[PDB]
Amino acid sequence: VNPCCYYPCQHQGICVRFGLDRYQCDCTRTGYSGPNCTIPEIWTWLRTTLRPSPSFIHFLLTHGRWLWDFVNATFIRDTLMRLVLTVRSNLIPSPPTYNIAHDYISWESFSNVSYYTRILPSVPRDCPTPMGTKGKKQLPDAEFLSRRFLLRRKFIPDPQGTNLMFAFFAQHFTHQFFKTSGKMGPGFTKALGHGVDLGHIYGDNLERQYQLRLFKDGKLKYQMLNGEVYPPSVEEAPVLMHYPRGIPPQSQMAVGQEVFGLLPGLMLYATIWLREHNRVCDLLKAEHPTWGDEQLFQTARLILIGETIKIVIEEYVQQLSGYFLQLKFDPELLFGAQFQYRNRIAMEFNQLYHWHPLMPDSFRVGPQDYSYEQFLFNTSMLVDYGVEALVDAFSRQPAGRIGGGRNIDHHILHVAVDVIKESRVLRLQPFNEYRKRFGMKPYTSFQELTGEKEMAAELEELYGDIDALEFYPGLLLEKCHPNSIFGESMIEMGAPFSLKGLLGNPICSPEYWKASTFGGEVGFNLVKTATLKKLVCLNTKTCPYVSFHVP
Amino acid sequence: VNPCCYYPCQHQGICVRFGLDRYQCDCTRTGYSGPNCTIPEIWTWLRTTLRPSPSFIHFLLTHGRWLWDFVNATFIRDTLMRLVLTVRSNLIPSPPTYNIAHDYISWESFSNVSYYTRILPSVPRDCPTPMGTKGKKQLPDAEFLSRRFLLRRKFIPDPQGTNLMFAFFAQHFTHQFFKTSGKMGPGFTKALGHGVDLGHIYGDNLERQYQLRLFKDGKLKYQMLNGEVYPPSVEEAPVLMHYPRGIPPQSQMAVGQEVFGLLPGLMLYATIWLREHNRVCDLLKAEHPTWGDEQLFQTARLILIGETIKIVIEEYVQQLSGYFLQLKFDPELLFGAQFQYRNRIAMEFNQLYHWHPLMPDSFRVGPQDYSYEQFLFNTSMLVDYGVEALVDAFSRQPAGRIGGGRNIDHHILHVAVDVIKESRVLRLQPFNEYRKRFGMKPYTSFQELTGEKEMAAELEELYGDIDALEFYPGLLLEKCHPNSIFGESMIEMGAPFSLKGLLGNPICSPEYWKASTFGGEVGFNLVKTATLKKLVCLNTKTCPYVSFHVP
Numbered sequence A, B: 001v002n003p004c005c006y007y008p009c010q011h012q013g014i015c016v017r018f019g020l021d022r023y024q025c026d027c028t029r030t031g032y033s034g035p036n037c038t039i040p041e042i043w044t045w046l047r048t049t050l051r052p053s054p055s056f057i058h059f060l061l062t063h064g065r066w067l068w069d070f071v072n073a074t075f076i077r078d079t080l081m082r083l084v085l086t087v088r089s090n091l092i093p094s095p096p097t098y099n100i101a102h103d104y105i106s107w108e109s110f111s112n113v114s115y116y117t118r119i120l121p122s123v124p125r126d127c128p129t130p131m132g133t134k135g136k137k138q139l140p141d142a143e144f145l146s147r148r149f150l151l152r153r154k155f156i157p158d159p160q161g162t163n164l165m166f167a168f169f170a171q172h173f174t175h176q177f178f179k180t181s182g183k184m185g186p187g188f189t190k191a192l193g194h195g196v197d198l199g200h201i202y203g204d205n206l207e208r209q210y211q212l213r214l215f216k217d218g219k220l221k222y223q224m225l226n227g228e229v230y231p232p233s234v235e236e237a238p239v240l241m242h243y244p245r246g247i248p249p250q251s252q253m254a255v256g257q258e259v260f261g262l263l264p265g266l267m268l269y270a271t272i273w274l275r276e277h278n279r280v281c282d283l284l285k286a287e288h289p290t291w292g293d294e295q296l297f298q299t300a301r302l303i304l305i306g307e308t309i310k311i312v313i314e315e316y317v318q319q320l321s322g323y324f325l326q327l328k329f330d331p332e333l334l335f336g337a338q339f340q341y342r343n344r345i346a347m348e349f350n351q352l353y354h355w356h357p358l359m360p361d362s363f364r365v366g367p368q369d370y371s372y373e374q375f376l377f378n379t380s381m382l383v384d385y386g387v388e389a390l391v392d393a394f395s396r397q398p399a400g401r402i403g404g405g406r407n408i409d410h411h412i413l414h415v416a417v418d419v420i421k422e423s424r425v426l427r428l429q430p431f432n433e434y435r436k437r438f439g440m441k442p443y444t445s446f447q448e449l450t451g452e453k454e455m456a457a458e459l460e461e462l463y464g465d466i467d468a469l470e471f472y473p474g475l476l477l478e479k480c481h482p483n484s485i486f487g488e489s490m491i492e493m494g495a496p497f498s499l500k501g502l503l504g505n506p507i508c509s510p511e512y513w514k515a516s517t518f519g520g521e522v523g524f525n526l527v528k529t530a531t532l533k534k535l536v537c538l539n540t541k542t543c544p545y546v547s548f549h550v551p
């Protein structure tokens, strides 16, 4: 059999086929040597034996508030943040490596941004089993697997107090870089840009952008409804939007991310950010009476890109992490480091971010309780209630726990089933192999994975070997940290993808991170002091309860 | 008047318009402060008062051969190459900054690779004069300027011994990253890739590449003639090639760069590299019998990119510099440095690279002497003589001196005329402003620029002021170093663009610079030991005199 099917090469070593049946591991710069890159160098050895486990660090970071407050007020905050940023980031290859067509480095893979990249090469097509060498010749029925371990029975709230405001931000935010192409197939994205470029607000292509712009004062087109500002209709902004046949254009809003009409939650943020852009335009014009529409537009976009990163690191991730350490967004922390300011979305990162357990059984707005059939394509909810009302509602309703299993509402369970099926098409390597790729020891049994016995026994019977457990199912079934939203894998595997994506942005480079880039001191401060509360309230008639945490 | 027309900000400070008539300079990280970034910080002052002049370092590098022979044999060689690589590179913005549409940082300028980038922004369209503030309301007639100062009268050979083998290499090589879009206009390129991607061999788009590929053994299509290997015909590889109307497809050669059929010298190199790609494929298959066509092709491509960068630094640039220091291509030299492995072609680099003075009065091949009329669209010379014969001839014929003036053959003088006109459309800033941006003191007069008085006087009368002198004319009229091919500006401005262009390629990054990237140790050595002599002679029946220097 093909030797690489055994994943012989350890610690990021590269398996290459030589001759008709041999293989070799390129252990270059892995910190190890030997046939499979297992013989540790002196510093490699010290580092791995002195490194406390993920569980222990997580414990340190969620205990001793008093000590953390003291630390957050010192330069240590800067030391630890830079540490998190660099260590977390070094786990992501930059420039990118493989894609769905090349399980090896190639010029096509480096230049062709229509491909998602991947961290581990696919499971070779000629391996004994679908997962490589372990498990059964046939994987568990995707739908049965989902109905048995992911379907929600009783709604489980997130112990960390995460609300729907956070849940919709996450969806809205990620859909600017997760845009799998239906015509091209799995492993392909339309989200060229591969990151926080705000394409979900300005469009992922120029012509779409243009149809969305006013071309006056650098602003975005809009319409007034009830004396409030909302994205324009597809009639004033002839842009492709995905709405069910039978809905008139005069009821379809145009936003840049064609799929946003599918949820009031998504169109809410589309509205909020649109209002913020035009607001920033007004501020720039006061400072620069000589500027034209283009410069105003471009500069506001850079500012909004900055605000988003600021808000994602300091509030979004802060809420997710649960850390007592006050995370900080400051590009300077990396100026003395070796870091590439480029980013490429990975298919694994896409899989990992399918956080459907967050959605509730129904959507409570005031005393009214809306069902999925009343929420999904409602093109009038947003305008009926307005921004303040929905923000207050979503900020008050608790979202579901992500990890732990059995927590995805039946209405959207089909999404999980399809993620599992796509994983097999993409031939994603086993969960334990990804565990290793991110610094963890593989699980030695299902009972070790879940913190229990019943599910474990049933998973063991279906998969046959813990080494056959798949990527996505692994993330969602792994036991959660104490009172956390998900397990360690989600953190240890997602932190690297996230942070590299936030800081590996051109505006974070020494060349771009200057006040001139944002129109001056005033534009720069909008980025440096951006807040979820200001994003909403500086754009609404009244200020509601706004937060990523339930009250 | 627009205050920025005075180019008030120094040392890379960014001029920004504020209010109705004010301006401010963003001196962030320039090493200076004050309204125009002219008040140095203590260290900035030490560094600039200790830095010897460009003419001095040039001197130290072109003297004391004895001394350099020991240096090149020790780690000092590396220490210096790194020093050159980093200091030269830091003068090039990365990520890129402005483009023909935006004289300011923008997401569109960063994401849109159809635009050439630019180092200095354009002269604001609302300035008193075309160059900003100095000179006459109208610039000298491009053709007049060309006839008077760039037209050849008597062939001036390159004192450094450069031959036509070098000239044609330079043309072949650069036309892979210099491909101005006729349909889109100046400031636009079709050579996405922006660097050494070998698109002039494989094509600048996938479909062209697919039409050029054999899809067997990862090889490129070809045809046999006189028992020799040449590029296929357009009838066998249906690709758009620019040939005079009337030449049927059966008689065209398909190569990657549509414009190459227009010169035997160009198609010569197209032939050599084609034979090299297919040769490398053979070596690869021997090593990896289990590989398919895709991986053989891709890996072969990466190896050629490496060879190209290798030969360009160690032989090409060595020839140009005339340094006693032996330049070295070793990506590891920057592994400890802060370097961005990306590159974006600048319009200035395009202009600067117009080295038409290199071309002779005619092309001698054996006892025969061909004229431009016989050379330019000759569709049989390459095959009539074959690779070896032409290489021998081109390696023996001297090329013209680039700098000094009056040395462009009348047959191609029109390129220079249009180059100057494009410059005014691109609104390139004055030569002196570029001298500064690249670390040199501006010229205080035309007599200082030229090393004489005759041309200096005529130039002064035409331009009126030294500060009105345009980019390209400045480069070609500047007094040349002793027995050099061109002036110091050509080096001080070209070096940063070149070196950044060579090392700012993903294959030179830690993630790619591994043996596995090139199919193993064998592939990695083809790159590490690449040579002009080997590039020719390992793909020809006999080995002729091959070199960038005349015998």
Ligand code: HEM
Residues within 6 Å of the ligand: A167, A168, A170, A171, A172, A174, A178, A179, A180, A263, A350, A353, A354, A355, A356, A358, A359, A412, A414, A415, A418
């Ligand atoms: C009303 C609740 C939601 C519904 C109805 C929904 C529906 C969908 C659907 C239909 C797809 C494509 C499915 C397919 O092709 O089979 C999808 C993809 C996805 N969803 Fe959701 N989703 C919801 C909430 C969320 C949330 C809260 C997140 C968390 C960030 C999320 C993240 C994703 C991601 C990352 C993808 C894949 C992106 C891509 O490749 O284009 N979804 N969702």
Ligand code: HEM
Residues within 6 Å of the ligand: B167, B168, B170, B171, B172, B174, B178, B179, B180, B263, B350, B353, B354, B355, B356, B358, B359, B412, B414, B415, B418, B419
């Ligand atoms: C018989 C010899 C040559 C001929 C007939 C020739 C002809 C041309 C022509 C017709 C153009 C485009 C002119 C226009 O649009 O007005 C051009 C552009 C150019 N040539 Fe040459 N050339 C020759 C040799 C060279 C050499 C030796 C070099 C040095 C590397 C060179 C570098 C360039 C560059 C950099 C451009 C601009 C590229 C672009 O923007 O696409 N040329 N040449």
Ligand SMILES: CCCCCCCCO[C@@H]1O[C@H](CO)[C@@H](O)[C@H](O)[C@H]1O
Residues within 6 Å of the ligand: A034, A038, A039, A040
């Ligand atoms: C001074 C401290 C010494 C600690 C001893 C560590 C020894 C590491 O030993 C290594 O373990 C790997 C996994 O079992 C093997 O694959 C390697 O071949 C082996 O050398």
Ligand SMILES: CCCCCCCCO[C@@H]1O[C@H](CO)[C@@H](O)[C@H](O)[C@H]1O
Residues within 6 Å of the ligand: A051, A052, A053, A054, A057, A060, A061, A080, A083, A084, A087, A088, A091, A438, A439, A440, A492
């Ligand atoms: C208490 C101080 C905490 C500093 C934060 C360290 C940054 C997080 O570091 C992470 O630790 C994990 C556990 O060992 C590793 O598996 C990850 O690869 C590493 O990036």
Ligand SMILES: CCCCCCCCO[C@@H]1O[C@H](CO)[C@@H](O)[C@H](O)[C@H]1O
Residues within 6 Å of the ligand: B051, B052, B053, B054, B055, B057, B060, B061, B080, B083, B084, B087, B088, B091, B438, B439, B440, B492
């Ligand atoms: C003998 C030691 C040689 C060291 C090589 C230095 C690399 C060349 O360095 C160059 O020097 C010029 C003159 O000061 C500067 O104007 C350029 O910006 C700089 O890149």
Ligand SMILES: CCCOc1ccc(CC(=O)O)cc1Cl
Residues within 6 Å of the ligand: A084, A088, A317, A320, A321, A490, A491, A494, A495, A496, A498, A499
């Ligand atoms: C996809 C979700 C991203 O989640 C995270 C990103 C970063 C950190 C902080 C760290 O430990 O480095 C924590 C979490 Cl949970």
Ligand SMILES: CCCOc1ccc(CC(=O)O)cc1Cl
Residues within 6 Å of the ligand: B084, B088, B317, B320, B321, B490, B491, B494, B495, B496, B498, B499
């Ligand atoms: C214009 C073409 C490029 O020319 C050069 C590039 C690099 C170097 C070496 C150095 O940095 O000094 C010298 C020359 Cl002439």
